[PDB]
């Protein structure tokens, strides 16, 4: 069959569990859910690895290293208005020079400068605060509390079955979201991958598959640690000491570390670049800085020494 | 000079801090974009018709957003309207957010120029036709309606029957809009003319 | 069940949302600080006058 | 001198803004003060001694 | 008695006595120092 296998309601089994129960196959070599019903139906070896559910998400966007993005908290038209006002004040001073009025005009200009710098400082502060007071989603509890961003898991998948028998706040929130909106659930992992690529969609599935696709993709990212323990055991015949023979054989393999090396033979090999924006900071980049280049503009006049 | 300098510094510092606090608090949250805004802010009263399908859906829904929305609307009876027309009128006249079936707000906005549809699609309920037991006609009307669906006729009927679409600004480039320096320009010109009056 | 009974008989009255930070038409919080500099100027003026 | 003036203004403004942002977010951040908080959340691990 | 949540002291501190390299990135201070150095000599060379 095209699935792991499960007993629905009649006491009948399908897939690897049925084959192992019938003992027409001696071991199940594949990822396989570990549930008490099938554990009683067929004995399972100790899992060759443990895993949970992870979150596939679209890569964050918004890297704009531009000088214009540094004077952003200011309408440029207002800035030119201030410049024209300042030059008008200067020319008024120059023409009038041919007293107390000069000082009072200087004082009012001082006050306007205070006002404008205060407004700029306040606006830039608000922009940076509202930027950094929010954070990218890192946990499924965040998914449960929010409703603006679509999210889902593969239907008829292992995560679905686990969450069916798991009732924690976020889990029934998830189930309510699934029931409410059937347009945020899929039947195949690739469909969910396409959903993530097209729309800002959160995907929940077995961690290993997400790790593989993230290490085989550069336009997606994985966020969040394990929210559950699943485990992938190995089937064994009824009353077989070979079950233990498997388990110890697995145990020394973990001690040997060959599973990690072979996993990186299959999983890793990715070359996704890294950015400094992952720690929620804008300090030390053209978003903060970049006007030192403007200093050279004044330097060209700084070399006129004679007529 | 030192004491006046400290006075000026502290007063301008207080002014700048208050300025920042104001714009932040207006800018720290969006005017309105989704029900999540109602989730995190409460300046706008929201509700629906009592015993309506919307509040029943909120009761049966386990979404913590709708859960807290129901808790709020139960907390304040002032957010409860006995009839949908009363809520429509109070929203049109005063600050109030009405939650109702999407096609109702669609038609109202088509038949209005001041109120607007707010929030994207949030529920999947739909409308169908009641069928008796042992009626193959239900199956026939099912397949016929499906045929009309790939025919797209329903769009034709809804556009024919629902068509009243009437007539925004961003103003986000500085604090409190572009219209913020006019007083500065006026006071500048007023101070400018004061220098020409006297000959000394 | 004792906790549930207490909550039933100590279910308070709802209160309006009041922890949201609000800042509007905030002045100098009634009194300012001009009095200190006014007093300092007055006290220094008398004995600079010597 | 004027462009240096503007640099100093903007840099001190940015410094004030980011430190104040840190202070404000620290003020709005609240730690756990009830088991209800653990019950509603899932991002913090907790346990008790069995038996 | 009832039950009590066990947790460490609230994590977070400031390395004494630095209180400006933590808010502002050090490279920003380095750039400011470089700019000050550069602008310093311009007036001296021009006036001379």
Tab-separated table of C-alpha atoms in Angstrom, chain A residues 55-62 135-137 143 146-152 177 181 183-184 191-204 219-221 223:
chain	number	residue	atom	x	y	z
A	55	UNK	CA	8.009	23.771	10.748
A	56	UNK	CA	8.797	24.476	7.103
A	57	UNK	CA	8.463	28.176	6.288
A	58	UNK	CA	9.349	30.684	3.597
A	59	UNK	CA	12.681	32.473	3.872
A	60	UNK	CA	12.353	35.909	5.521
A	61	UNK	CA	12.666	38.812	3.089
A	62	UNK	CA	13.477	42.477	3.554
A	135	UNK	CA	9.758	38.502	16.110
A	136	UNK	CA	9.561	35.736	13.505
A	137	UNK	CA	7.454	32.760	14.519
A	143	UNK	CA	0.707	29.393	15.303
A	146	UNK	CA	-2.225	33.734	15.681
A	147	UNK	CA	-4.760	33.502	12.873
A	148	UNK	CA	-3.362	35.816	10.168
A	149	UNK	CA	-0.926	33.273	8.691
A	150	UNK	CA	-2.062	30.029	7.089
A	151	UNK	CA	-0.592	26.803	8.437
A	152	UNK	CA	-1.219	23.105	8.146
A	177	UNK	CA	-8.119	25.580	12.492
A	181	UNK	CA	-10.452	25.935	6.860
A	183	UNK	CA	-7.886	25.096	2.211
A	184	UNK	CA	-4.826	24.839	4.491
A	191	UNK	CA	1.822	20.051	-2.370
A	192	UNK	CA	2.662	21.667	0.961
A	193	UNK	CA	6.124	22.577	-0.314
A	194	UNK	CA	4.501	24.321	-3.274
A	195	UNK	CA	2.116	26.093	-0.897
A	196	UNK	CA	5.085	27.351	1.127
A	197	UNK	CA	6.877	28.469	-2.036
A	198	UNK	CA	3.829	30.343	-3.340
A	199	UNK	CA	2.200	31.769	-0.200
A	200	UNK	CA	3.607	32.409	3.269
A	201	UNK	CA	2.461	29.029	4.554
A	202	UNK	CA	3.625	27.066	7.591
A	203	UNK	CA	4.057	23.315	7.149
A	204	UNK	CA	4.196	20.767	9.968
A	219	UNK	CA	14.155	29.342	-0.848
A	220	UNK	CA	12.806	27.726	2.340
A	221	UNK	CA	13.782	27.436	5.994
A	223	UNK	CA	12.110	26.790	12.337
